[model samples]
Target chain A: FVNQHLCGSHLVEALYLVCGERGFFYTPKA
Target chain B: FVNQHLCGSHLVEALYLVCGERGFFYTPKA
Candidate 1:
């Protein structure tokens, strides 16, 4: 589980970990 | 904490909850 209120960088990483979308930000996998 | 393996829709909401960057995807707050 990703911690709520994660810092910007951590949020990006966590988003990838959760969703498997790799990038500077998390986007819907297309 | 957000579930590690969230579905697409859930992922979007979780991203916002974690980082406060609301959108179809998660991006760094600028």
Candidate 2:
């Protein structure tokens, strides 16, 4: 799982998960 | 850049970029 992959990193995956299945819309300014 | 702007957001930009550039494998539990 991508969330699992980020386990050791300093990033937060909850927002993506919370935003629902199509949360990509809230992606950062990049 | 959105990635750069997330300086203190704790979310990793690589996952977002990686998911698009490569592929994502997570389905939210929410």
Candidate 3:
């Protein structure tokens, strides 16, 4: 029911764009 | 600046979030 993302944003630790559920948030440090 | 993304939201053709300059977009389709 949700999707998580650790994207390239200094101010944000996590970003959720809204989706079915389960996301690949294991991204490189920004 | 801005970061463009094509996410699961079916109503949206494209997405643009505020940022620096060169935006990060074009992810895998849902």
Candidate 4:
């Protein structure tokens, strides 16, 4: 289990940190 | 990019979907 908190600004960096991959990106679906 | 929106309630679920793991948790440090 990846134990970490979510980032309020750098969501991409946060995802990368947890997944250990920089190829991931996030897009808010509104 | 993950190309997904952030959830307001299901953050853990969101992380799981993005990272392909159910072993994750999120806590807002406020």
Candidate 5:
């Protein structure tokens, strides 16, 4: 179920994996 | 005015450059 998938990992890790290390740090806003 | 020269807030009371409180985690990539 989608609910189970949602629990896969913390939001931070999920975002990191999706975006990669460089993309995370080199954000335009920062 | 220099648009790029963004004025960052200083923790004037603490004598530190105020970058906001820590643990306001960003998704390094996300």
Candidate 6:
């Protein structure tokens, strides 16, 4: 996980992390 | 497009950019 790239499999998972940090200021779903 | 945050709708768009950058890795789908 810590030694690879990102794709569609973990798309949701990836955004979860991205939004947690910064840059991402919004989420579509509730 | 260049002056907005990320949301569920733009999740995939954001990830594609992030992956092309650094830090994150492992894209589940193609």
For residue B7, give model 6's deviation from the true position in Å. 0.9
* Candidate 4 local lDDT, B1-30, one digit each (tens): 345666543454456566542234444442
| Cα lDDT, all candidates | 0.54, 0.42, 0.33, 0.47, 0.30, 0.48
lDDT measured at residue B20 in model 6 versus the true structure, 0 to 100: 46
Superposed model 1: Cα runs more than 4 Å off:
A1-30, B21-30
- Each prediction's fraction of true contacts recovered: 0.12, 0.07, 0.00, 0.00, 0.17, 0.00
Please write out the lDDT profile of model 6 over residues A1-30, one tens digit for every residue: 435675553654656565554433223332
What lDDT tens digits, residue by residue, belong to model 2 across residues A1-30? 444444323233555545555443332324
Q: Relative to the unseen true structure, what is the C-alpha lDDT of residue A28 in candidate 4, on a scale of 0 to 100?
A: 53
TM-score of each: 0.31, 0.22, 0.17, 0.27, 0.25, 0.25
lDDT of 5 by residue, A1-30 (tens): 223343212333444455544423222134
Query: Could you give the DockQ of candidate 6?
Result: 0.04
Output the better candidate (2/6) by DockQ.
2
The superposed Cα distance between candidate 2 and the true structure at residue A17, in angstroms, equals 1.5
Specify the poorest-scoring 10-residue window by lDDT in model 2 chain B: B3-12
Q: For residues B1-30, write the lDDT of model 3, one tens digit per residue.
A: 125443453312223233234333323433
lDDT of 4 by residue, A1-30 (tens): 235565443454456456542234354542
lDDT of model 2 at position B5:
40
Candidate 4 chain A: worst-modelled 10 consecutive residues by lDDT: A21-30
Higher-TM-score candidate of 2 and 6: 6
lDDT of 6 by residue, B1-30 (tens): 535776643654555555543334333333
Candidate 1 on B1-30: residue-level lDDT in tens? Answer: 585887654655576567554434543343
Candidates ranked by TM-score, best first?
1, 4, 5, 6, 2, 3
lDDT (Cα, tens digit) per residue for candidate 2, span B1-30: 444545322234455555553434443333
DockQ of each: 0.09, 0.10, 0.04, 0.04, 0.10, 0.04
| Candidate 1 local Cα displacement, residue B15, angstroms | 0.2
